[PDB]
Design a protein around this nucleic acid. Structure first.
Ligand code: K
Ligand code: K
Ligand code: K
Ligand code: K
Ligand code: K
Ligand code: K
Ligand code: K
Ligand code: K
Ligand code: K
Ligand code: K
Ligand code: K
Ligand code: K
Ligand code: MG
Ligand code: MG
Ligand code: MG
Ligand code: MG
Ligand code: MG
Ligand code: MG
Ligand code: MG
Ligand code: MG
Ligand code: MG
Ligand code: MG
Ligand code: MG
Ligand code: MG
Ligand code: MG
Ligand code: MG
Ligand code: MG
Ligand code: MG
Ligand code: MG
Ligand code: MG
Ligand code: MG
Ligand code: MG
Ligand code: MG
Ligand code: MG
Ligand code: MG
Ligand code: MG
Ligand code: MG
Lengths: 260, 186, 181
RNA sequence: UACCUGGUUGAUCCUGCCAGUAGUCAUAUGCUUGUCUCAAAGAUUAAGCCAUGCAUGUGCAAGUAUGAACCAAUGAACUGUGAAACUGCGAAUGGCUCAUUAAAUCAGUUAUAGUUUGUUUGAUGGUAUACUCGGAUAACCGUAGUAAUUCUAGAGCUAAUACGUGCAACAAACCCCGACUUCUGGGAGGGGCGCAUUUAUUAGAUGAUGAUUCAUGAUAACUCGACGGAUCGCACGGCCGCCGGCGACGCAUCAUUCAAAUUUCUGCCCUAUCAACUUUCGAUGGUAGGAUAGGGGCCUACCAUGGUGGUGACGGGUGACGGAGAAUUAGGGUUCGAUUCCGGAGAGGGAGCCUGAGAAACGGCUACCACAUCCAAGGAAGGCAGCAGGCGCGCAAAUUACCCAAUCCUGACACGGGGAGGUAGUGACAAUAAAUAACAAUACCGGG
RNA sequence: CGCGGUAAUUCCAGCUCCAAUAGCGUAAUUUAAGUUGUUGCAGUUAAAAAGCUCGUAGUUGGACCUUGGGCCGCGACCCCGUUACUUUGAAGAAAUUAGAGUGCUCAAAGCAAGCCAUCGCUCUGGAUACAUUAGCAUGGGAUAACAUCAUAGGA
RNA sequence: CUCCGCCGGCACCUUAUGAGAAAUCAAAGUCUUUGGGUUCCGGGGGGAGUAUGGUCGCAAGGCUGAAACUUAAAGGAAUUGACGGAAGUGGUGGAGCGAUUUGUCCUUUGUACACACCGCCCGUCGCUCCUACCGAUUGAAUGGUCCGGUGAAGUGUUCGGAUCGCGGCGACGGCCGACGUCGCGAGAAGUCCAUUGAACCUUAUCAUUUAGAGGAAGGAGAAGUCGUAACAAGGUUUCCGUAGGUGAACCUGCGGAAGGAUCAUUG
């Protein structure tokens, strides 16, 4: 190619979007923004496929051009805006607030949150280093730069950001024993506590996580997001509570529900 | 045009590589600046990838030169090109390239040395600071003997064809001895 | 690109390797006559479905009884075989799935069950009755005789409400005859 | 379904092949063809040649209206709605094709501590007439030329977020020189000092990485720096003229995102009746440069003699784009993979470029070769392997239809546009379901 | 393979019958083929052991080294050489394949949907498996390969 | 000399519990209950060990080694019969995979015959077609490389300066306008060198396509001719290698084999 791609073929769209195969030749190509294209949930999908507010592309445009949707406290009119993990989606007309979390099957789920709980997001620190003028600055995986961060904050940390004031109100150090959520790979959406961190020089670092029921899983450092200090996450979790179920137990639940 | 691709080369085994694509613009080369030492300063704007700017010096006569032991940097005129390590053609053509050895005017450095040390190579405060600096003052007598002629041996550390400037450092110590031996063997 | 190109399709039957074997021809004709089939392909597709089910059951029998895939997929297969009336209650093992024949599948057709329910005088009369839109399963009329009837839907096979045999008005033949009279 | 059958003999048992038997999201062709759903479709030969039409344009309250434009109002700069045009952005995506290409593309897996990146998101921005600078130009208007083309000259006007200038709200700190002072110091004054650029010195300990003379600081200078707002909309209040909100557009830096480029390892069909190949004129490495966005013989100068090879180098063939995959498959395997997803490459063949963040672009330009169009013979204009359609070639493949309603992309943009894409037409490629009769009575044949 | 020379079960026809059936016939590739053979073929006489020997690469290479035992309790206890191999984990796009759910009327499909009827609800669902080789990591050391392997001159 | 052992060697006899299509084989066994290691080597019959290329050899030739085309069999072992210009009918049971055989003691033996020797068969020369090969003419046509050149166009560079602006000094004429005067800036055509480089010409080579007089194969089909070389001891047993000769099958010399017509002379 002689430049950037503008189109996303529907077959080549992320599989967690759960787009259907015959809905068209194309999928919404996510715009550049805070989250990666392959790891985000675009606004058009949230509005039409998930919340059912809109029925068409044009209806999503109509809703967004009314300035009805705020992402993390700010009005977005781009339909392909890449909304991502832990983002607050608020509609200050119906009075509903949503935190974009992962279910245990790797798919973004709009989790309803309280009005007070929609006043902060959780960000993962990507790096800490000196900017111009020798001023220390923090950057996250959701594209934010924060200057003069707390010196106790290091890379891979989780900071609590107040959307109203745009400051770090609290932070969590990436340590063994902190409850985490996996945001990438086959364990996406799984919640557990870190048991040990296995480091290997020159290559990716492996984190060993054990969930509440005792199942153990391992994932790379880049796919781990701390959500609480200790065994108590700072945000509310979806109904699964991050506890992945085997297909046999899912069938048990379905059989019990049908029997009732 | 000039390209930088590995397409046209032979393989490491010696076998010829058949072309599978025309030349791309993202692998181009441009013709050398061939910066000459001349008092007709010409630096041209080269528009490069990303909409960025490269400065292409064609003729230069003045440079920014650093005397590292003294930690002083002065703008001096370029007088001559004397040694090139890659091609004496560049010496006879007076071509300014990075790592070329040149003659630079010593007058700014003489002036700074007189002002700073009080030594040519009116207050109690000024005389006190001058005596403090003069204590431990040590020149190397090679820089001194070229100061006698007013020409300092210098090495162009900047790339004139890229930045449009002919900057460098004054030669000192073992490098100075090496290049004096080379110039006397020339 | 055309989006319609991504729709899947597949074949439902194979032809026999030996076309002119007396024994196979006699057995196929016996089944076809017993169940009023329109051609050999209707029996061949039932054999194809039985072949895929049998292959699945055999592949889970060649795995450990604790293999979580055999517990899961064998349970699903047994549920599907009990759902369509192909297996009894005592037959609650993957071994009995391997013992199923094309007769068991042909006995669950809407044609066969309409004939055996007393709604039709013969298997062929059942076939025409279904193709004439006189038969409904539940509230849904079914004009497809190869319809596989679940056990929960067996007791809801009934004459259509729009059909002259199910409380509806007389057909065009009868009405034309009375108009002539 | 882990399967065989005919054929050598006068007869037999073998070996062994021929023939039969089944499949093909496998092509063509023949005959036949009622209904439903589904659906390939000029790849194979010619990446052969193309008449005609269409496939890319774009306007918000928010850059620029004085249409001699329209509606409504009726001493006022500009009512509103606005064609045109300038300015901005896009046209580097998509679509098509598979010619070239055999460790090459490509796949998985690395790397950038070896780079560029319009845009998005987040953060950042201080030492350079002002109650606001200058000259043009389009549209418009009217003199034209030419056979002619979004071929073209001259004259009269007038805009800016076009172009070009120019105060740039002010400051501390820090560095250097340094009159005087009474003095290991104090110190007026002068110079430097925004950000960026280039070089050099220095700090970075015992902030960061597995690892950096790293991030970053300080200092000396340097650069004839396209930087550091002379822009627009809505609302317009608070103090006595001064302050004042919510936005839009734009400049620069870092980070992020969208990506590319290059790059590590391993992996490819047949052929030895291809065993040596590469190295003048780069072949393998080294030094110093040049060039590039950046590494690199990428190129140059000098130097050394290396580098690959029966573990098949080099060469040749491929009716060879690679992969995901497809057909057939007890298992193992065999064959295919032009085609809708990913990657690559090309736009008759080469080559070279401009613009631009991004192209060695072809529905952009320049030239040559080959074809070829109009001409008033002076010139002028070309590129369907986009959609449709037409010649030709062939065994072999559809309409010069409708539409942006869906999907989604793009623009100044909720609005325009989209032969992307969809809808219908042709369509026994292939696939799914499924009629052409059922019942009864007489008569017959029966059987039980 | 064969039939047809006057009685043609085989040609040309009629009748009847047979197979498949809205389909069927005819003209590269898979199966059949254990007729390419790794699984898995042959080589006295059917095709096929080089005339014979040496010999480099390649391929293949004898045996030997921490075993028992009990206790607690299937884990544990007690008395700065590599690699193959194996185990587990992370990856290996989607679509295709296998497969869970779901009565498009069935089916090929699709990724929908379902609920006594609900100004709504089921957080509705939109699983999972597979994915050579090569790469990364974990445990194991039986088997095997390479490197050593009495100046140990050891500590 | 005799007897008993052990190891190693050339062999022999019997037997199947084995294997095999059988003949037969104590390995040719330990094989669908399929795997000790390793080398070479076969894939229906011809064409064909032929053409061509390469290599070795003085040569003879050796090694490597096709294709086109043609054909439904060729071939192996064994059985019965027939023939030899070779010698002298069931049953049941048993053997064999079996055809068969024993019983039934013309037989044995060889067979490439089974229409059964009045058989089968080989080759030259005739004649109809097909395929392939060699082949001078330094045979042509097509394209790619090699060597020299020529070289569009672009890009960069050197001069160049049509022209256009801004200002300047002083002045003249009535802020405008003209001229002379002098700086700065922009800058077209053209031009210089370099670079990329299409394309053209030249030498030779390679890859193609490729006529081709003539020569010489192979196959198929009619089928004539001359003989009878292979099959019986085939009437000179057959065949292998090499050399020479002949109308043709072939003959002969030297060495070899039984696939022989002899498993046999302690006589
Ligand atoms: K690219
Ligand atoms: K553009
Ligand atoms: K790769
Ligand atoms: K470079
Ligand atoms: K080098
Ligand atoms: K642009
Ligand atoms: K649309
Ligand atoms: K739009
Ligand atoms: K012995
Ligand atoms: K008998
Ligand atoms: K003879
Ligand atoms: K003989
Ligand atoms: Mg098989
Ligand atoms: Mg494209
Ligand atoms: Mg630094
Ligand atoms: Mg270098
Ligand atoms: Mg090709
Ligand atoms: Mg392909
Ligand atoms: Mg092709
Ligand atoms: Mg196509
Ligand atoms: Mg593609
Ligand atoms: Mg291109
Ligand atoms: Mg063409
Ligand atoms: Mg081009
Ligand atoms: Mg075109
Ligand atoms: Mg294009
Ligand atoms: Mg009919
Ligand atoms: Mg007949
Ligand atoms: Mg065989
Ligand atoms: Mg023989
Ligand atoms: Mg033999
Ligand atoms: Mg051993
Ligand atoms: Mg074997
Ligand atoms: Mg053969
Ligand atoms: Mg008997
Ligand atoms: Mg004879
Ligand atoms: Mg004889």
């Amino acid at each position: 190619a002689r430049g950037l791609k503008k189109h996303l073929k529907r077959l080549n769209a992320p599989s967690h979007w759960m787009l259907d195969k015959l809905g068209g030749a194309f999928a919404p190509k996510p715009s550049s923004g805070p989250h990666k294209a392959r790891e985000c949930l675009p606004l058009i999908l949230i509005l039409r496929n998930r919340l059912k507010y809109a029925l068409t592309y044009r209806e999503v445009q109509s809703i967004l051009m009314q300035r009805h949707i705020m992402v993390d406290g700010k009005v977005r009119t781009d339909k392909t805006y890449p909304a991502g993990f832990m983002d607050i989606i608020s509609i200050p007309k119906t009075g509903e607030n949503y935190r974009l979390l992962y279910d245990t099957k790797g798919r973004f789920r709009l989790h309803s949150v309280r009005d007070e709980d929609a006043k902060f997001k959780l960000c993962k620190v990507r790096s800490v280093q000196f900017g111009q003028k020798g001023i220390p600055y923090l950057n996250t995986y959701d594209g934010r730069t924060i200057r003069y961060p707390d010196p106790l904050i290091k890379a891979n940390d989780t900071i609590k950001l107040d959307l109203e004031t745009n400051k770090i109100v609290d932070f969590i150090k990436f340590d063994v024993g902190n409850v985490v959520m996996v945001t990438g790979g086959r364990n996406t959406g799984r919640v557990g506590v870190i048991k040990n961190r296995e480091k290997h020089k020159g290559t990716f670092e492996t984190i060993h996580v054990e969930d509440a029921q005792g199942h153990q899983f391992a994932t790379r450092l880049g796919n781990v997001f701390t959500i609480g200090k200790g065994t108590k996450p700072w945000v509310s979790l979806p109904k699964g509570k991050g506890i992945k179920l085997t297909i046999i137990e899912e069938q048990r639940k379905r059989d019990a529900a049908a029997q009732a | 045009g000039i390209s930088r691709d590995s397409m046209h080369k032979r393989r490491a085994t010696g076998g010829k590589q058949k072309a599978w694509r025309k030349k791309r613009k993202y692998e181009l080369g441009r013709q050398p600046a061939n910066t000459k030492l001349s008092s007709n300063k010409t630096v041209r704007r080269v528009r490069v990838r990303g909409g960025n700017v490269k400065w292409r010096a064609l003729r230069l006569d003045t440079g920014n030169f650093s005397w590292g032991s003294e930690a002083v940097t002065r703008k001096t005129r370029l007088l001559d090109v004397v040694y090139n390590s890659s091609n004496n053609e560049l010496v006879r053509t007076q071509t300014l390239v990075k790592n070329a050895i040149v003659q630079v005017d010593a007058a700014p450095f003489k002036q700074w040395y007189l002002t700073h040390y009080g030594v040519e190579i009116k207050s109690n405060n000024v005389q006190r600071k001058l005596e403090k600096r003069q204590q431990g003052r040590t020149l190397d007598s090679h820089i001194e003997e070229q100061f006698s002629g007013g020409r300092l041996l210098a090495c162009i550390s900047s790339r004139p064809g890229q930045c449009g400037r002919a900057d460098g450092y004054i030669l000192e110590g073992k490098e100075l001895e090496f290049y004096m031996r080379k110039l006397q063997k020339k | 690109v055309h989006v319609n190109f991504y729709r899947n399709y597949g074949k439902t039957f194979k032809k026999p390797r030996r076309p002119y074997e007396k024994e196979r021809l006699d057995a196929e004709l016996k089944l076809v006559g017993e169940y009023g089939l329109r051609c050999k392909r209707e029996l061949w597709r039932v054999q194809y479905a039985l072949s895929r089910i049998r292959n699945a059951a055999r592949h889970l029998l060649t795995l450990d009884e604790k293999n979580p895939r055999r517990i899961f997929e064998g349970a699903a297969l047994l549920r599907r075989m009990n759902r369509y009336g192909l297996l009894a209650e005592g037959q609650d093992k993957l071994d009995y799935v391997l013992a199923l024949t094309a007769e068991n599948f042909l006995a669950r057709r809407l044609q066969t069950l309409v004939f055996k329910a007393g709604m039709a005088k013969s298997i062929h009369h059942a076939r025409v009755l279904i193709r004439q839109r006189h038969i409904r399963v539940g509230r849904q009329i079914v004009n497809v005789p190869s319809f596989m009837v679940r056990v929960e839907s067996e007791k809801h096979i009934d004459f259509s409400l729009t059909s002259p045999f199910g409380g509806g008005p007389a057909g065009r033949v009868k009405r034309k005859n009375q108009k002539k009279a």
